[PDB]
Design a protein around this ligand. Structure first.
Ligand SMILES: *[C@@H]1O[C@H](CO)[C@@H](O)[C@H](O)[C@H]1NC(C)=O
Lengths: 49, 43
């Protein structure tokens, strides 16, 4: 809730941006793990009676 | 950089000089003003 949000953001935003990029890459990686383990075969088949 | 700037796609008040009424308003100066003059005969 700072008054000078623009000045602090301009000074220190790229550091947080690269850290957030790294953490977002981690999250996308976890999605890649879920796709790797659960979507090996994409042929969705009807559940038999 | 963060500084005083003119926002893009802003509405700029446009004031004529001739109509036979000649009027120039006393516009307020707040946080700097961008002024554009498009004439050829240095009026
Ligand atoms: C331009 O003018 C309209 C009113 O005519 C206004 O609603 C809008 O905020 C203004 N926007 C721009 C393009 O600066």
């Amino acid at each position: 809730d700072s008054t000078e949000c623009s000045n602090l953001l301009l000074q220190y935003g790229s550091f947080c941006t690269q850290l957030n990029r790294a953490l977002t890459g981690i999250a996308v990686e976890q999605d890649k793990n879920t796709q790797e383990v659960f979507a090996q075969v994409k042929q969705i088949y009807k559940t038999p009676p | 950089t963060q500084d005083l700037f003119l926002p893009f796609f802003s509405n700029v008040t446009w004031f004529h000089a001739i109509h036979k009424r000649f009027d120039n308003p006393v516009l307020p100066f707040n946080d700097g003003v961008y002024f554009a003059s498009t004439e050829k005969s240095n009026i």
